[PDB]
Design a protein around this ligand. Structure first.
Ligand SMILES: Cc1cc2nc3c(=O)[nH]c(=O)nc-3n(C[C@H](O)[C@H](O)[C@H](O)COP(=O)(O)OP(=O)(O)OC[C@H]3O[C@@H](n4cnc5c(N)ncnc54)[C@H](O)[C@@H]3O)c2cc1C
Ligand SMILES: Cc1cc2nc3c(=O)[nH]c(=O)nc-3n(C[C@H](O)[C@H](O)[C@H](O)COP(=O)(O)OP(=O)(O)OC[C@H]3O[C@@H](n4cnc5c(N)ncnc54)[C@H](O)[C@@H]3O)c2cc1C
Ligand SMILES: Cc1cc2nc3c(=O)[nH]c(=O)nc-3n(C[C@H](O)[C@H](O)[C@H](O)COP(=O)(O)OP(=O)(O)OC[C@H]3O[C@@H](n4cnc5c(N)ncnc54)[C@H](O)[C@@H]3O)c2cc1C
Ligand SMILES: Cc1cc2nc3c(=O)[nH]c(=O)nc-3n(C[C@H](O)[C@H](O)[C@H](O)COP(=O)(O)OP(=O)(O)OC[C@H]3O[C@@H](n4cnc5c(N)ncnc54)[C@H](O)[C@@H]3O)c2cc1C
Lengths: 396, 396, 396, 396
C-alpha cells in the first residue's frame, strides 16, 4: 500500500491547490459569462496550478495521476467555476488521447512544453486526402472546448481518395498556428468554456501526426506492462467519468449553498419563516442529498474500476465498459433532477443573476447533455450488456 | 346549455386572438430578453387584443369570462412569449382582486378605461398610518410584475399608529402617477416580465382606495346572487390556477418543439441518426407527454371546480381549496420535471441561444417557484385537508 | 342535456347498488382468497344487482350504459372486492365483444337470458378446421377470468386447412356445456377471479357463432347511426379503460384506509406517536394522493373520449386510440407506485393477513400487468403517434 | 494490508458456504411459507454453516467478522431464501447486542454454546420490578424474529416501583426455558421468519442479565482498544445495514431472474415475441439495474464507514450515523421501487405461485417496512444533520 498512500497524498495536495487557486477562478466568473471564454487570470492560474497536467506523462514533466484523482479535482473545481472545471477536464482528457499517437508526435507536443494543452473534437468529420509526406485536411468542427487557449487540437476526419470516395477514419493532431477559430458558441450555460468551431482549409498535416480512427479508440494498451498505468487506462471511458465529475461537483456546490442559506430564509407564503423549521423541507433535502450521494458513488465506482484495471494491467471486458457508460449517464441524470429539487427548496430567489444557484443549474444542465453522458444511451448500453446485444455506439 | 355554448364560443374566439397577435409577441422576444421589459409593440397588441380584459367587468366594457377561459388563453400565449403570458395573467388576476374594493375605487380605475391594467404585490408590506381623509403609505415592494406598463397597483401594507405599533393589515390601490419604479429585476428567466420594485414614500392614499387585508382575501361574495359569476370566484385560487397555466403552456410548447425536430436530428453518439428511430426515445417521449397531460388535467380540474362554484353561487369548502393548491403545485412540478426530460430528448443543442427550448425551460422554471405555486406547500396543504389540520398558509 | 341528465341519474343509481351489495362481496373475500373462485353469495349478488348487465343491450333487457358509467362502477366495486370488480368488468367487456357476432348468435346468448355472462380469452389460439355447417375447434386457453360462473366464452383461434396450414384468424363463441375447465390459476393476487384454463377438444362450433378475427376487432360500427351508441364504442379500448378502473379503485380504497388509520398509529421508532403529527408524513400523503388523482383523470379522460365519439357517431382516429392506450398504462403505473408509497406510510402492519391494505396491494399489482394495460407498450404507442410510426400492437 | 487480505479471504469462504448450503434453504421455501417457521433442515444448515456465528466472539469459538462481511453474506442468502437471510441477520445482530451485557451473562450464553442464537425485540416494553437478586418481568413482545429456534431473547422493558410508577428503561436477557411463544405471525411476506409474540408472566431475571436501556444503546465501546474491533462497532446501525442487505439481495435475485427469463418470453400483446428485442424493455432494465446498483453502494458505503471506525477505534460522530440511517432507508426504498419495475418487465406471470419473482417481491416489501429502515424517517434524519436539528429518533 506504499503506492496507494502516495497516490492519496498527491490527490490531497491537488485538491488543496484547487482551493488555493479557486478564488481566482471564482473572480473571473462574471467576465467569463460575459465574454464566453476564460479570463486571462484563470488561464494563468490553470498553468501555474498544473491542473492541466494531471494526465500528462512524467517523462515530459507531467503529474501522471489516475482517473480517481482527476475526478476528485474536477468536482472541487466546479464549486468555483464549472466552466473552468469543464475546460480543465477536457484538456487532461485530450492530453490522454494524445498518447495513442506516435512518440514523434508526443515529443513535438510535450517535449519542450510540460504544460501543453490539447483540444479534441469528435463531433465532426473533416475530409482528408493523401499528399506526399502526409495529408491535406479540410473541415469544420463545432464544440471545440477551450480551443482559444489550446496549443494543439485532435480532430476526427474521414480519409478520401482522389475520386472522393471514403477510405477510412482518421485522427489528426494539428497545432494552433494551423487553426482558425470561428465564433459560434452562444449558449445559456457553460459559456466560458468557449466551445467554438475549428475551421481548416486544405491544411497540411504530416504523417506522424495522423493515426487511424481504429488506433485512436484502441484499448490494446490495457495489458502493456511497458507503459505506465495511466496509459493503460480506457481513455474514452475515463474522459466520460471526469465530464460527469464536473457536473456532479456543480450539483454538490448547489446542495452546499441551499444548506448554507436555509436557516436565514423562509418558504413563502407559509408560516415557515425559516426553511429549517419545515420538516417537509428538511426531509426533502435529505432525499435530494442522497440522490446526489448516489451520483457520487456511481462516478467513484467507475473511476475505481478504470484505475484498478490499469494498475493490474488487465483489459476491462465490454460488459464493464458498458456499465461505466450507464453509471455516468445515470449520475448526471440524478444531478439534474436533484438541481430541480434544490430550486424548489431555495425558491424564486434562486433565479436571480446574483445567485450562484442558477449558475450551477445552467452549467450542469448544459454539460450533462454531452453525448458521452447521454442517460438514455447509457441505459440501453447497460441493459444490453445483460444479454450480449450489439452495442448501439461504435466504440467503448 | 345555452350559456355553456356561449362561454365556449367566446373562449374559442379569444384563443384565435392569441394566434392572431402571437407573431407580434414572438417578434419581441429578443428585445424583451435584452431589456427586461415588454416591447412597445407587445404592449400595444395586449391592449388591442383585449387579453388584459378577460377578468374586467362587463359593466365597464370588459369581457368578464371565467377561470377556464383565462387558463386556456394563458397556455396558448406561452407558446409565443411566456413573459407576455405571465404579465397578461398577472393583469387579469390583479383586476379581479380589485373587485374587493368599493365601487368608488372601481369607477375611478375602470370608469373611463375598459382596458385598465393593474399590478398587485403581496410580497412585501409597507407601512401605513392614518391621516385625515385616508392614509400615508411608505414601503418597498419587490416582484412587481408588469408594473412598467400598469395604470394602478394593489399593494399590501401594515397599518400602524402614531406610536408605530401594529394595528392591522391593509390592501391599497395606488395609481401610476404616485409610484416610483426601481430597477431590480435581474433574472435568468421571465426577464421581460419586468417584475421590478415599487417604491413609495409618504404617499397619500384616500380611504375609498383602502380595504382591510381581511376583506381583500374574503370569499364572502361566493354566495352573492347580486354579483355576476366571475366576481363570486375564489380570486386568489383562480390567480394561482392561471399562473400554473402560463407554466403549463410553456411546457406544452417545449413538447411540440421536441416532436417537431425529432425526425431530423440524431442521438449522439449512437447509431440512431434519427431520434424517431430509437424506441427508447419514442417511449420516453410518450411518458413525458403523459406527465404534461396530467399537469394539464390538474389545472383544468381546478379551473372547473372554481367555475362550477361561481356559477352555482356556492362557497367552496376549505378542503376543495386546499386540493386546488395541491393541484397547481403538482402541475408545475410535473412540468419542470418534464422539461428536464425534454432536454435529455433533444440534446445539447437545446441550450443554444437560438433554440426556443431553453427559453421555455428558463421561463417555466423561474415562474414555477412563485410562492402560490410551491409544490411542497401544496403537498402539505392537501395532505392536511384529509385530517383537518390547521393550514400552513394564512389564506386560501 | 336531457340524456346527459338521464345517464348521470342511472350511474348514481348503479353506484348506490354497489354500496348496497358491497357488504356481500366483502363478506366473501376470505372464502374467495382460499378457494380461488367467487363464492356463491357473490355470484348471486352480481346477478341480482344487474352489474353484469351494464354493457348488455336494452333490446335483451340489459341496462346498456356507457364507458364512464362502467368505469365508475368498477372503481367503487374494488373497495369491497377487487376480484369481484375484475370479474364484473370482464363480463361486461365480453358481452360488449359479443356484439360483433351475428344476430343469430346474440339471440342464442341473450334471447332468454338478460343476465347472460361471457368470458373472453385472446391469450391463446386454438386451432379450428372447417367441417360441414361450421368448424371443429381444439385448444387450451389460459387466463379465463370468471369462466367457472360464465354461460359462454369468446375464444380466439387460428383456422387451418386439411393440410394444417394457416388460413386466417377466428373468434368463436362457445357455450359452457361444450367447455371443460382445468384448474390452473394459482396466484398471489386476484385469486377469486378464477382465471383458469379453458380446454376444448374437437368441439363443434356452428358457423353463426364464428366470425373473422378481423371482424372481432373491427371499429366500423363507430359511424353506424342504426346502432345504439354503446355498440358504436371502440370495444377493446373500452375494456382496457374499465380494467384500469378496477386497479384504480383498489388504489383509492388503499388511500382511504391509510387516511382512516393515520390518526391512531405512529411511525416507529420516531417521536411521532401519531402519523398525522408528522409533516413529512402528511405532505408525502398529499403527493401520493395527487398521483392517484392523476390516474383517475387519465381514466376519466379516456372514458369520455370513447363515449363522446360513440354518442356523436364519429370514428376515433388512430392517434386518439393510441393516446388511450397510453393513458391506461400510465394510470395503473401511477397506482402501483402509489401503493408502494402507501405501504411506506402505513408501516409493517400493512402486510398482516388481517389488514385490507396488502389485499389491495396484491390485487392491483397483479391486475395491472394485464397485457392491455402494459405501461411500457402504452408509452411506446403514444410516443409513436406523434410521428405516425407503425404501431407495435396488431389492433387498437 | 495483511489483515485486509485475511478479512477478504474469510468473506469469500463464507460466501462460498452460502452457495454450498443454499440448495437446502431453497428446498425448504415451500414448507416455510406453509408453516410460517423455518424447516428443521434449514435450521440444521444454519448451525452447520456457522452463519449465525459471524458476530459471535472468537473467544467463544465465533467467527468474529465485520459489518461488510455480514452484509455480503446476507445479500447472497436472500437469493435462496429471504426469510432464512432475515433470520440469520437478526441472530447475528442480536448476538452483537448481547455484548453490552456483563461477562457473566455472555459466559452463561456463549460459554458452552459457540453457535448460540439470540432473538431481540425492542418493539414492546414489558414491565419489570425489583425483587431480591434481580427483577420480576411481565410483558408481551410482538415481532420476535426467529424466536422458535432461538436459545435466548433480549427484551426491552420499563422498570417500575411498588407503586407502579416508571423508574427507567431496561434490557433483559432471558432464556428459552423461561419464555412462551404465542402464534401471532400471519403475514403475506417473510412468513418463515416466524416473528411471533414472546410472552412472559412474572418471570424472574437475575441482575447480571439486566442492563439499563442506556447501556444497551451505548456507543462508548467505540474507542476501547481493549475490545476486538467488532465490539467497537455501532451495533444498532450495523444491524440496520444488514437488514437492508437482506432486502437488497432479494432485489438482486429478482433482477437476475428477469434477465434469465427475458430471452424466452415476449411482451403481450406487442409484436415483441422476445423481451430482448424491445429496446424500451432493454433500456428500462438498464435503468432499474442502476437503481439497484445505487442501493448496493449505499449499503456498502455504510458498512465501510462502520468498519473503518471500528478498526481505527474512533467514535462515529452523530452526523455520520444520521447519514447511515438515510442510506439504509434509501437503499430499501430504491429496491422496492425497482421490484415494481421488474414486475412490469416480467409481466403477469410474475404473480404465479410457481414464480420466484413474487416471493422476492413479497419478502423484500415486507422486510423493508421494518422501523429501522423507514425511508421517510431516514430522509428527515439525514436532512436534519445538515443543520444540527434534534434527531427524531431516541437513539442512533
Ligand atoms: C458544453 C459542451 C462541450 C462539449 N465539448 C465537446 C468537445 O470538446 N469535443 C467534442 O468532441 N464534443 C463536445 N461536445 C459534444 C458532444 O460530442 C456532442 O457533439 C453534442 O452532445 C451534440 O450532440 P448531438 O446529438 O447534437 O450531436 P451531433 O450533432 O449528432 O454530432 C454529429 C456527429 O458527431 C458524432 N459525435 C458527436 N459527439 C461525439 C463524441 N463525443 N464522440 C464521438 N462521436 C461523436 C455523432 O455520432 C454524430 O454523428 C460538447 C458538448 C457540450 C454540451
Ligand atoms: C417571475 C415571478 C414573478 C412574481 N411576481 C409577483 C407579483 O407580481 N406579485 C407578487 O406579489 N409576487 C410575485 N412573485 C413572488 C411570490 O409571491 C414570492 O414573493 C416569491 O416566490 C419569493 O418568495 P420567498 O420565499 O423568497 O419569500 P419573500 O419574497 O422573502 O417573501 C416575503 C414575505 O412575503 C410574503 N409573501 C410573498 N409572496 C406572497 C404571496 N404571493 N402572497 C402572500 N404573501 C406573500 C411571504 O409570506 C413573506 O412574508 C413573483 C415571483 C416570480 C418568480
Ligand atoms: C388477473 C389477470 C386476468 C386476466 N384475464 C384475462 C382474460 O380474461 N382474458 C384474456 O384474454 N387475458 C387475460 N389476461 C392476460 C393477458 O391477455 C395476457 O395474457 C397476460 O398479461 C400475459 O401476458 P404474457 O406476455 O405473459 O402473455 P403471453 O403468454 O405472451 O400471451 C400469449 C399470446 O397471446 C397474445 N395475447 C395475450 N393476451 C392478449 C390480449 N389481451 N389481447 C390480445 N392478444 C393477447 C400475446 O400477444 C401472445 O402472443 C389476464 C391477466 C391477468 C394478470
Ligand atoms: C419482518 C419483520 C421483522 C421484524 N422483526 C423485528 C425484531 O426482530 N425485533 C424487533 O424489535 N422488531 C422487529 N420488527 C418491527 C419493527 O421494530 C417495528 O416494530 C415495526 O416496524 C412496526 O412499527 P410500527 O410503527 O407499526 O410501531 P409499533 O411496533 O406499533 O411500535 C411500538 C413501539 O415500539 C417502538 N419500536 C418499535 N420497533 C422498534 C425498534 N426496532 N427499535 C426501537 N424501538 C422500536 C416504537 O417506538 C413504538 O413505541 C420487525 C418488522 C418486520 C416487518
Amino acid at each position: 500500500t506504499d503506492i496507494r498512500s502516495e497516490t492519496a497524498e498527491l490527490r490531497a495536495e491537488l485538491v488543496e491547490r484547487v482551493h488555493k487557486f479557486g478564488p481566482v477562478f471564482a473572480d473571473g466568473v462574471a467576465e467569463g459569462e460575459r465574454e464566453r471564454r476564460l479570463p486571462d487570470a484563470t488561464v494563468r492560474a490553470i498553468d501555474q496550478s498544473q491542473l492541466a497536467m494531471l494526465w500528462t506523462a512524467k517523462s515530459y514533466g507531467g503529474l501522471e495521476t489516475d482517473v480517481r484523482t482527476m475526478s476528485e479535482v474536477a468536482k472541487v473545481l466546479s464549486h468555483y467555476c464549472p466552466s473552468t472545471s469543464w475546460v480543465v477536464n477536457n484538456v487532461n482528457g485530450s492530453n490522454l488521447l494524445a498518447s495513442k499517437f506516435p512518440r514523434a508526435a508526443l515529443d513535438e507536443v510535450f517535449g519542450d512544453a510540460p504544460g501543453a494543452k490539447l483540444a479534441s473534437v469528435f463531433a465532426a468529420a473533416g475530409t482528408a486526402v493523401r499528399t506526399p509526406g502526409g495529408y491535406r485536411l479540410t473541415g469544420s468542427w463545432p464544440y471545440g472546448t477551450g480551443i482559444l487557449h489550446d496549443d494543439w487540437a485532435i480532430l476526427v476526419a474521414r480519409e478520401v481518395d482522389a475520386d472522393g470516395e471514403p477510405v477510412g477514419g482518421l485522427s489528426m493532431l494539428v497545432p494552433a498556428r494551423d487553426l482558425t477559430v470561428e465564433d459560434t458558441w452562444h449558449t445559456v450555460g457553460m459559456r466560458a468554456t468557449g466551445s467554438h468551431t475549428v475551421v481548416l482549409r486544405d491544411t497540411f498535416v504530416p504523417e506522424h501526426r495522423v493515426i487511424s480512427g481504429e488506433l485512436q479508440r484502441s484499448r490494446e494498451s490495457a495489458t502493456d506492462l511497458g507503459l505506465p498505468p495511466l496509459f493503460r487506462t480506457a481513455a474514452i471511458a475515463a474522459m466520460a467519468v471526469v465530464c460527469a465529475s464536473v457536473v456532479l461537483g456543480a450539483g454538490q456546490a448547489a446542495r452546499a449553498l441551499v444548506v448554507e442559506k436555509a436557516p436565514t430564509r423562509g418558504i413563502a407564503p407559509s408560516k415557515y419563516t425559516r426553511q429549517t423549521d419545515s420538516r417537509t423541507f428538511v426531509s426533502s433535502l435529505g432525499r435530494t442529498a442522497l440522490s446526489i450521494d448516489a451520483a457520487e458513488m456511481h462516478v467513484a465506482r467507475a473511476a475505481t474500476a478504470l484505475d484498478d484495471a490499469a494498475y493490474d494491467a488487465v483489459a476491462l471486458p465490454d460488459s464493464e465498459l458498458l456499465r461505466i457508460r450507464g453509471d455516468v449517464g445515470q449520475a448526471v441524470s440524478l444531478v439534474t433532477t436533484a438541481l430541480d429539487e434544490l430550486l424548489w427548496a431555495h425558491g424564486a430567489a434562486s433565479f436571480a443573476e446574483s445567485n450562484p444557484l442558477q449558475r450551477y443549474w445552467r452549467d450542469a444542465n448544459t454539460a450533462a447533455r454531452h453525448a458521452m453522458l447521454n442517460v438514455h444511451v447509457g441505459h440501453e448500453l447497460y441493459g444490453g450488456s445483460f444479454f450480449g446485444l450489439d452495442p448501439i455506439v461504435p466504440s467503448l
